[PDB]
Amino acid sequence: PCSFGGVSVITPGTNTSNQVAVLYQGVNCTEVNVFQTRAGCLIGAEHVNNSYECDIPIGAGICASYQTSQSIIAYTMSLGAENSVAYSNNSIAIPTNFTISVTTEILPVSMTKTS
């Protein structure tokens, strides 16, 4: 059976711009700025080799964002800043001052008793 796929659109919010990004699922670009993933064919973006945090997930470690003209870019998502701690057999990390933070957490409890 000749190839098919799901049609999916990548975009920022309408309160930013109206530029788009077109993603074809599970089939590569030879049958439709062209970029290829394991997810399929992504049209309407630009491959960048800088690592940011993810904005919208796409698949296979690929996320897209709309930054500064201004256009759709995509990249391989990071896992935050690379960091390591100096280790020895005679070192330790001991604090001296502190803060008191408050984090909002929200859990849903009930729903409307429909009948």
């Binding site: 005679n90 990390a93 604090p95 001296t96 408050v102 984090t103 957490e105």
Partner: protein, 122 residues
Amino acid sequence: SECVLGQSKRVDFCGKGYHLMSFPQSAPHGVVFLHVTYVPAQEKNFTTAPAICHDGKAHFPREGVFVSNGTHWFVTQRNFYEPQIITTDNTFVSGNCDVVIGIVNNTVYDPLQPELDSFKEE
């Protein structure tokens, strides 16, 4: 239960950090907790040591570890920096100090001996 009615030990369960206490608030179809943690900052680096031998006898600290004030071996607890002088009531003694690997050298101050020293002066 665990975070409003009392103080859970369970880390990573009500907010991020050592859990202190919380406050609940009303919400439509829901609840909103406000957790209060103890997040530390502003650290230095500190040369450490597992124990101290004084007169052949080892010393393990009752709480805390032995810390750095520069190149000296003083002592405080494990989650806030407030160094102390090594006394007997901060440690205890179990065994010879030769099986203990990584041990360092320091004197151990005693509280009783200078109060004893006030007797032998007179």
